[PDB]
């Protein structure tokens, strides 16, 4: 599917640093991951007396 998607086969690409602009020497794994946010927000955790 990846090679059908015209994406790099190994699922890894060399990225570019967003501050130095220098490409990282080793290709890194990127992609789309289903990320959740749990009911543990700090707004109800920050107590102070």
């Amino acid at each position: 599917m990846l090679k059908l998607a015209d994406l790099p086969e190994s699922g890894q690409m060399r990225l570019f640093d967003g501050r130095t602009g220098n490409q990282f020497e080793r290709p890194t794994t990127v992609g789309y991951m289903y990320m959740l946010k749990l009911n543990h927000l700090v707004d109800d955790k920050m107590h102070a007396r």
Binding site: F24, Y34, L36, H40, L41, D43
Partner: protein, 187 residues
């Protein structure tokens, strides 16, 4: 004595107008709580008066119920009327009159059904509540909070990979692809 619905409320703002002897038992939003009030509810014990807020609330509720049932009557009555007009030729003699009379009878039956249902719902609404003893009238309010994700909030994927968001750095600092596409999350 009640906040207008749809009012942004900072911390400590008074919400309910309550009077003691003659001090004030007025309710205030707790500190650290700030949002928008979206709904107010008021309930009164049997034998106690209904405040203008409750009167108005019951007003739009009754209006909504009436309009819903009127529309439900409208759709079915239109279907029946057009079905009858289609059965009859372009505008025998006894059959058409019989069908028109039967349609009128069905329309009257549905009208009386819907009206009786409306009176039943109305009567159900006008009743008081079985509030707790010592409680004359009770009032509750709701608030809406838009919790933006901020550093410290716990985030976890699907494979048992938890995490606490450390910082939120600007878009430039994110690692970007040669095409210029930056990533959002750096695990």
């Amino acid at each position: 004595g009640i906040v207008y619905v749809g009012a942004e409320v900072q911390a400590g703002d008074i919400l309910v107008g309550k009077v003691t002897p003659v001090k004030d038992t007025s309710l205030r939003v707790p500190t650290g709580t700030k949002g928008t009030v979206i709904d107010v509810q008021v309930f009164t014990r049997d034998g106690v008066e209904r405040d203008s807020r409750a009167l108005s609330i019951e007003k739009m509720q009754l209006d909504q119920i009436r309009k819903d049932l009127n529309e439900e009557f409208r759709i079915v009555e239109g279907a029946t009327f057009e079905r009858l007009r289609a059965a009859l030729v372009g505008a025998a003699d006894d059959a058409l009159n019989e069908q028109l009379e039967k349609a009128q009878a069905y329309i009257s039956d549905r009208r009386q059904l819907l009206d009786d249902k409306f009176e039943d719902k109305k009567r159900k609404l006008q009743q008081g509540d079985d509030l707790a003893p010592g409680v004359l009238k009770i009032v509750k309010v709701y608030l809406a909070i838009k919790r933006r994700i901020q550093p410290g909030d716990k985030m976890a994927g699907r494979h048992g990979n938890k995490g606490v968001v450390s910082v939120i750095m600007p878009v430039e600092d994110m690692p970007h692809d040669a095409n210029g596409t930056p990533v959002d999350i750096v695990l």
